[PDB]
Design an enzyme around this catalytic site. Structure first.
Site, PDB file in Angstrom:
ATOM      1  N   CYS A 108       0.851  -1.113   0.015  1.00  0.00           N
ATOM      2  CA  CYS A 108       0.111  -0.034  -0.130  1.00  0.00           C
ATOM      3  C   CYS A 108       0.747   1.201  -0.099  1.00  0.00           C
ATOM      4  CB  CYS A 108      -0.985  -0.002   0.987  1.00  0.00           C
ATOM      5  SG  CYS A 108      -2.076   1.528   1.033  1.00  0.00           S
ATOM      6  N   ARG A 111       0.110   4.589   2.626  1.00  0.00           N
ATOM      7  CA  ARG A 111       0.137   4.405   4.244  1.00  0.00           C
ATOM      8  C   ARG A 111       0.283   5.785   4.885  1.00  0.00           C
ATOM      9  NH1 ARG A 111       3.866  -0.460   4.764  1.00  0.00           N
ATOM     10  NH2 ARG A 111       4.606   0.188   2.792  1.00  0.00           N
ATOM     11  N   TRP A 280      -9.134   5.884  -0.966  1.00  0.00           N
ATOM     12  CA  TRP A 280      -9.579   6.458  -2.103  1.00  0.00           C
ATOM     13  C   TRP A 280      -8.651   6.127  -3.227  1.00  0.00           C
ATOM     14  CZ3 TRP A 280      -8.587   9.489   2.486  1.00  0.00           C
ATOM     15  CH2 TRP A 280      -7.196  10.143   2.388  1.00  0.00           C
ATOM     16  N   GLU A 285      -4.827   3.666 -11.040  1.00  0.00           N
ATOM     17  CA  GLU A 285      -5.463   2.264 -10.850  1.00  0.00           C
ATOM     18  C   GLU A 285      -6.575   2.234 -11.778  1.00  0.00           C
ATOM     19  OE1 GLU A 285      -6.091   0.895  -6.436  1.00  0.00           O
ATOM     20  OE2 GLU A 285      -5.811   3.179  -5.967  1.00  0.00           O
TER      21      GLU A 285
HETATM   22  C1  HEM Z   1      -6.555   6.457   1.914  1.00  0.00           C
HETATM   23  C2  HEM Z   1      -5.937   6.332   0.477  1.00  0.00           C
HETATM   24  C3  HEM Z   1      -5.390   5.057   0.159  1.00  0.00           C
HETATM   25  C4  HEM Z   1      -4.543   4.964  -0.969  1.00  0.00           C
HETATM   26  C5  HEM Z   1      -4.231   6.040  -1.932  1.00  0.00           C
HETATM   27  C6  HEM Z   1      -3.906   3.655  -1.352  1.00  0.00           C
HETATM   28  C7  HEM Z   1      -3.402   3.386  -2.237  1.00  0.00           C
HETATM   29  C8  HEM Z   1      -3.122   2.048  -2.722  1.00  0.00           C
HETATM   30  C9  HEM Z   1      -2.652   1.315  -3.789  1.00  0.00           C
HETATM   31  C10 HEM Z   1      -2.642   2.026  -5.152  1.00  0.00           C
HETATM   32  C11 HEM Z   1      -2.911  -0.061  -3.670  1.00  0.00           C
HETATM   33  C12 HEM Z   1      -2.570  -0.871  -4.970  1.00  0.00           C
HETATM   34  C13 HEM Z   1      -3.943  -1.326  -5.569  1.00  0.00           C
HETATM   35  C14 HEM Z   1      -3.782  -2.264  -6.430  1.00  0.00           C
HETATM   36  O1  HEM Z   1      -2.759  -2.356  -7.342  1.00  0.00           O
HETATM   37  O2  HEM Z   1      -4.842  -3.113  -6.740  1.00  0.00           O
HETATM   38  C15 HEM Z   1      -3.000  -0.121  -2.392  1.00  0.00           C
HETATM   39  C16 HEM Z   1      -2.968  -1.787  -1.868  1.00  0.00           C
HETATM   40  C17 HEM Z   1      -3.573  -2.095  -0.591  1.00  0.00           C
HETATM   41  N1  HEM Z   1      -3.918  -1.184   0.365  1.00  0.00           N
HETATM   42 FE1  HEM Z   1      -4.109   1.113   0.111  1.00  0.00          FE
HETATM   43  N2  HEM Z   1      -4.333   2.722   0.007  1.00  0.00           N
HETATM   44  C18 HEM Z   1      -5.130   3.745   0.569  1.00  0.00           C
HETATM   45  C19 HEM Z   1      -5.734   3.439   1.983  1.00  0.00           C
HETATM   46  C20 HEM Z   1      -5.762   2.079   2.280  1.00  0.00           C
HETATM   47  C21 HEM Z   1      -6.334   1.466   3.505  1.00  0.00           C
HETATM   48  C22 HEM Z   1      -7.389   2.605   4.361  1.00  0.00           C
HETATM   49  C23 HEM Z   1      -6.055   0.349   3.890  1.00  0.00           C
HETATM   50  C24 HEM Z   1      -6.653  -0.625   5.215  1.00  0.00           C
HETATM   51  C25 HEM Z   1      -7.043   0.002   5.846  1.00  0.00           C
HETATM   52  C26 HEM Z   1      -5.339   0.028   3.029  1.00  0.00           C
HETATM   53  C27 HEM Z   1      -4.459  -1.279   2.836  1.00  0.00           C
HETATM   54  C28 HEM Z   1      -4.191  -1.752   1.729  1.00  0.00           C
HETATM   55  C29 HEM Z   1      -3.836  -3.103   1.574  1.00  0.00           C
HETATM   56  C30 HEM Z   1      -4.041  -4.353   2.427  1.00  0.00           C
HETATM   57  C31 HEM Z   1      -3.236  -3.407  -0.019  1.00  0.00           C
HETATM   58  C32 HEM Z   1      -3.004  -4.526  -0.879  1.00  0.00           C
HETATM   59  C33 HEM Z   1      -4.222  -5.053  -1.667  1.00  0.00           C
HETATM   60  C34 HEM Z   1      -3.849  -6.086  -2.270  1.00  0.00           C
HETATM   61  O3  HEM Z   1      -2.702  -6.790  -2.150  1.00  0.00           O
HETATM   62  O4  HEM Z   1      -4.504  -6.550  -3.202  1.00  0.00           O
HETATM   63  N3  HEM Z   1      -4.796   0.986   1.937  1.00  0.00           N
HETATM   64  N4  HEM Z   1      -3.217   0.756  -1.613  1.00  0.00           N
HETATM   65  C1  JM7 Z   2      -8.986  -0.378   0.014  1.00  0.00           C
HETATM   66  C2  JM7 Z   2      -7.806   0.178   0.657  1.00  0.00           C
HETATM   67  S1  JM7 Z   2      -6.862   0.491  -0.856  1.00  0.00           S
HETATM   68  C3  JM7 Z   2      -7.291   1.750  -1.785  1.00  0.00           C
HETATM   69  C4  JM7 Z   2      -7.103   1.897  -3.156  1.00  0.00           C
HETATM   70  N1  JM7 Z   2      -6.567   2.865  -3.660  1.00  0.00           N
HETATM   71  N2  JM7 Z   2      -6.855   0.753  -3.865  1.00  0.00           N
HETATM   72  C5  JM7 Z   2      -7.630  -0.377  -3.584  1.00  0.00           C
HETATM   73  C6  JM7 Z   2      -7.856  -1.302  -4.931  1.00  0.00           C
HETATM   74  C7  JM7 Z   2      -8.341  -0.673  -5.889  1.00  0.00           C
HETATM   75  C8  JM7 Z   2      -8.195  -1.483  -7.396  1.00  0.00           C
HETATM   76  N3  JM7 Z   2      -6.861  -1.479  -7.770  1.00  0.00           N
HETATM   77  C9  JM7 Z   2      -9.265  -1.005  -8.424  1.00  0.00           C
HETATM   78  O1  JM7 Z   2      -8.679  -0.375  -9.426  1.00  0.00           O
HETATM   79  O2  JM7 Z   2     -10.269  -1.089  -8.134  1.00  0.00           O
END
Ligand code: HEM
Ligand code: JM7
Ligand code: HEM
Ligand code: H4B
Ligand code: H4B
Ligand code: JM7
Ligand code: ZN
Lengths: 411, 407
Positions: A108, A111, A280, A285
């Site tokens: 993520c 963070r 968000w 993405e």
């Molecule tokens: C607040 C704005 C946030 C942004 C901009 C962000 C950004 C991202 C992005 C770009 C990814 C990769 C998505 C993908 O390639 O499919 C990701 C993955 C992830 N995020 Fe976030 N994130 C946010 C919030 C959060 C929150 C609130 C959580 C949990 C409380 C979180 C936990 C995770 C986890 C566990 C992954 C891995 C998902 C996976 O492996 O499929 N993130 N994040």
């Molecule tokens: C839920 C916490 S991480 C928030 C986020 N920014 N991405 C979540 C994955 C979205 C996916 N790549 C999509 O394009 O639907």
């Protein structure tokens, strides 16, 4: 043992000590790196170390390590585990636990926000209908009319593994995919299988290119049940381009709320199999992956055609040129409609800052380069040039098998 | 212990059995992945020789033959007697082709078997090295129809008689720190440029000055040589639609020729082994031109295109990045100097991966390096799981000589 990471743009060297607290394996050996592999019932015996270790972290963080309250809590949990084989987290511990799972999520990039997380304790939930109401409230709170707020809803933990709460959707909001008799796909090809399950369960599919899927909710190991999210709660953004007036005619839109619903939250050895969370979007993405993967909406050709690029030869870089314009469009649309979104320059720069701060204050920041580097323009973002260390800390968000593969059908 | 790699775009799954033949260590543990770090005796030698010669004799399908045993014996007798051994021409060529084959950071490996190997083990002086190098440059440049090559100088002895090319590439532009405070030329080469000046080079002090070779033979002090200018092919950079682009005054050289690595074949160490192929466009347009610590030209290009540089979210960096790269490809194509775009090169590597899986049981690949520094997910390698491991024969990094050399 100290480990150093260097940034090749700035020559900044950081020192990681935090990796010494990792326990879980990575998938790599001294002989093989699996850094690019996508996916590489507990006993009383094994549970109490995990509980104790977590509670020690929690108590250190609140500066009450070694206190009477810390010690009482340890004994209380020990004795709870001894007699019931599990234990209940206090609210404060659940919140702290969920914030840390996010803080520890090495894939993520968002963070920097880890400390601002709205935790909805849904542990009193007993039915799928109960789950539906929780999820609607989560969707509404998090959407906040475009001013998005991070949130997580935590339903009751695994007990014997025969009573799991699960959200069968991979995200709370996602579009249906439909495989046609001619081999083409209507809608989102990523979601064909789950769409089929939804239809089989009794959903009436509209069969269009952007149908919001129903929620398929499983409570207490029971068979799952379908629910339509109220459409008025589903915020969408029609996609237009600031200079290209033909762009709107592509008919693209996207939903504002990314909410991952298929992961497992582990805190103190306890397993929260339904724990949907949302933040968000980063623009890439949608504009890079969801629109331009060949296995997704695959719009590169149609856009390039409309721009009249030279498509006879790859070396004209038409794909790259269409790609930028699509992502400009996504960012432009969200911002024009006042729906939160972050570009990949801003998000990666924020992350580098967060990461340095984390090294200073915590002795490290586990990070997965392969995932953190954006899928367009990699090297003009500061993360590309940043060496990272990837390792596993608890609390954590884990993958888990899709439920249709494991579920014991009741009838 | 048998391993699967999945392509997430195509669902094709390949099974890796080649990693079990893995020798060197990765940097990674079960606890920590270091996948993104840039730099993670008679008794030692004979197993290494045996291992290599077994694989060689297996390759010409004569494993366990008399000719195989005989060679093992010969090499063994030689090591016991002289503390080292010499490779037959056949073993040297096979060793070089295979070090390239095993190069996990190289996307261009579908070409691995078409390699020209110049045996320079008879070289004894820096002047000889200069002659060999000019000849490599000319052969490889080939008036723009570039051809892969390696020139291999004598192997390490007691480590006090090493051959080294001090340059990081045969052809590079100089870098000068100015009184102003900025850098003129290529900031990556500032230190090596100082070594040239302190060794006696007369620098022209311009933006695109080809560096002189600094050649060390037989462990002696390195000596300076200028490549004949007529042997350094260069390309002026223009854009097919922006007439103003030429006025940035940009050029690059056609020959990418890495000169600072160490070739290891069968335990023997070839510390001077310059090798060359041809450029993938992104190397110049994205990295060389747009890296903040390289020529860092995005701002100027974006300024000429009249983009909104007020906010990051207009993606003006991304827009200018594409154009800068269109110009690199277009300029090289118009001058008929071999170049490959990142789409075409990554597609090739995927086909190469499949070949290596079905004919070898694997292909070591470093995803961090294989995925182009622009438009990553729209190239197929982005979606392709890769296993990274170290096989020998190999190209290896080695400490810069100015830290090692006692003058
Ligand atoms: C607040 C704005 C946030 C942004 C901009 C962000 C950004 C991202 C992005 C770009 C990814 C990769 C998505 C993908 O390639 O499919 C990701 C993955 C992830 N995020 Fe976030 N994130 C946010 C919030 C959060 C929150 C609130 C959580 C949990 C409380 C979180 C936990 C995770 C986890 C566990 C992954 C891995 C998902 C996976 O492996 O499929 N993130 N994040
Ligand atoms: C839920 C916490 S991480 C928030 C986020 N920014 N991405 C979540 C994955 C979205 C996916 N790549 C999509 O394009 O639907
Ligand atoms: C013929 C066309 C070739 C293409 C298209 C190609 C492509 C590439 C690319 C894109 C890289 C990464 C370079 C960087 O990011 O700095 C690379 C690295 C490398 N290549 Fe090639 N290459 C070619 C020829 C060769 C040859 C002839 C050899 C050896 C004989 C070779 C061996 C290597 C090695 C050892 C690396 C890693 C160098 C480093 O770590 O800096 N390649 N190649
Ligand atoms: C094989 C490879 O690991 C896979 O394509 C990964 C690469 N990096 C990624 N990075 C992000 N953010 N999201 C992804 O789905 C992926 N996919
Ligand atoms: C820290 C990171 O490993 C470093 O920036 C790498 C990333 N990927 C790369 N990939 C290639 N081909 N070349 C490079 O120099 C780098 N640099
Ligand atoms: C020499 C064998 S690999 C050939 C190649 N394509 N690149 C090598 C490195 C060149 C560097 N990236 C540059 O941009 O000058
Ligand atoms: Zn690893």
């Amino acid at each position: 043992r100290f480990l150093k990471v260097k940034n090749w743009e700035t020559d900044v060297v950081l020192t990681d000590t935090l990796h010494l607290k990792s326990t879980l394996e990575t998938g790599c050996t001294e002989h093989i790196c699996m850094g690019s592999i996508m996916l590489p019932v507990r006993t009383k015996d094994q549970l109490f170390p995990l509980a104790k270790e977590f509670l020690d972290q929690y108590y250190s963080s609140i500066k009450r390590f070694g206190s009477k309250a810390h010690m009482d809590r340890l004994e209380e949990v020990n004795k709870e585990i001894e007699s019931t084989s599990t234990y209940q987290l206090k609210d404060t511990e659940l919140i702290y636990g969920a914030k840390h799972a996010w803080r520890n999520a090495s894939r993520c990039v968002g963070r920097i926000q880890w400390s601002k997380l709205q935790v909805f304790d849904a542990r009193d939930c007993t039915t799928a209908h109960g789950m539906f109401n929780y999820i609607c409230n989560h969707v509404k709170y998090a959407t906040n009319k475009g001013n998005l707020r991070s949130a997580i809803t935590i339903f009751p933990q695994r007990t014997d593994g025969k009573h799991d709460f699960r959200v069968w959707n991979s995200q709370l909001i996602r579009y249906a995919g439909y495989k046609q008799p001619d081999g083409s796909t209507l809608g989102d090809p990523a979601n064909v299988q789950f769409t089929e399950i939804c239809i089989q369960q009794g959903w009436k599919a509209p069969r269009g290119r952007f149908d919001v899927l129903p929620l398929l909710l499983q409570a207490n190991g029971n068979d799952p049940e379908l629910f339509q999210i109220p459409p008025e709660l589903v915020l969408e953004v029609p996609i237009r381009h600031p200079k290209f007036d033909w762009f709107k005619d592509l008919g693209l839109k996207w939903y504002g709320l990314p909410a991952v619903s298929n992961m497992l939250l582990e805190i103190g050895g306890l397993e929260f199999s339904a724990c949907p969370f949302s933040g968000w979007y980063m623009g890439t993405e949608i504009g890079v992956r969801d629109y331009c993967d060949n296995s997704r909406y695959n719009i590169l050709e149609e856009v390039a055609k409309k721009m009249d690029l030279d498509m006879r030869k790859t070396s004209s870089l038409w794909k790259d040129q269409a790609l930028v314009e699509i992502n400009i469009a996504v960012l432009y649309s969200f911002q024009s409609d006042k729906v939160t979104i972050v570009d990949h320059h801003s998000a990666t720069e924020s992350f580098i800052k967060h990461m340095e701060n984390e090294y200073r204050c915590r002795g490290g920041c586990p990070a997965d380069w392969v995932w953190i580097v954006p899928p367009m323009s990699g090297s003009i973002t500061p993360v590309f040039h940043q060496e990272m260390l990837n390792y596993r800390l608890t609390p954590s968000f884990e993958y888990q098998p899709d439920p249709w593969n494991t579920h014991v059908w009741k009838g």
